Symmetry: D2
Subunit: 101 residues, 4 copies
Amino acid sequence: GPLGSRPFRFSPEPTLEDIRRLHAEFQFHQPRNLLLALVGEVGELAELFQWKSDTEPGPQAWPPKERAALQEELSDVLIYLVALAARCHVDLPQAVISKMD
Amino acid sequence: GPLGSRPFRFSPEPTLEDIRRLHAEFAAERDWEQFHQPRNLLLALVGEVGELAELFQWKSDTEPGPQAWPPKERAALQEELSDVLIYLVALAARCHVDLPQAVISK
Amino acid sequence: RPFRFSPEPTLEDIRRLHAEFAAERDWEQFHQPRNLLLALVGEVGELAELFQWKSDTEPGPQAWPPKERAALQEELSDVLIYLVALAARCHVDLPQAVISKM
Amino acid sequence: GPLGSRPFRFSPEPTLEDIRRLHAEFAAERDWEQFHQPRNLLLALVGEVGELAELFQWKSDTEPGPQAWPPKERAALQEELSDVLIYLVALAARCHVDLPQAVISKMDT
């Protein structure tokens, strides 16, 4: 019915290419520095779930404030991941295809 | 000159959404959804982040750069980078977070 | 004065000290394997942050100024404590798993 | 009963200092001190944390549980927990941080 279960989907933009072009528009962008920075954000992301066990409600039912924190940490991880991949000259989008075979 | 010249770029596709749907299909087709719970995907991502760090662990800061890494290492790097990306996408989708939008927002 | 770790506390001391700090707070419900594992990943992240701005220059962390060294000690010990807590929750004898690993 | 539970405890040794020495000896024998710079050890630690995370990734916490896993898995667990501790010890030492003392200092507040 009209009140439930629309499928979840991502917006079509920005794309991985757009995201990279945005990062460079914003030294310390050495591979290991970006890798360490990624690890730090992955840690932030993990902090949000550490005490969130089975006995509790999942992320799509978390309070708007909590969800906002989740969107931020997920975002940070992606940003450094794109930056790192770019820096390494790895065609990230393609790498995903050259994988699934 | 007409030599080592290539303004590195990402291909215009797959898009993050293409990657999501792509991975969603691959899973639904194998009945993997049961494993795709948030903490599971989070821990899977951490596992892949560990694999990626392994490629850089003994690599010095003054060295050439991943760009100049032998081909076998460059291939491993491609795989791990994209392994981490796939799980990050799976995790955001499972949490119903529109990743692309959260990044421009960020 | 050659560098060394102090003789104690030991890993067992650490396990004990942590086990009591939490008990005196009724935190046992929070010490489930995956919870502790994720908390540990969280601290490894804090530790990583102290080094992303750096580079392995000859003068290492040993020459880091006071505030930065206090921070490194803190994050390092934060990681160790959750690791100890995780091992205990898993009934893994960490000290022995180590020697038996050589 | 006789087949019921019992208090869990770590062995009295090796100590953290003992572990630092054993690892130092190992890197000495194989000549790895040159690769054991702080950032290398951190990233190596991150790698082992990844190995450890893999053992738990598809396991719920309301499931059998580690103290009940198959011996082969419990063996892998022991190995990965050890790997994380070893690099942690190595990173600390390489940074001249008295790890045990840092714990005490922490507990003081």
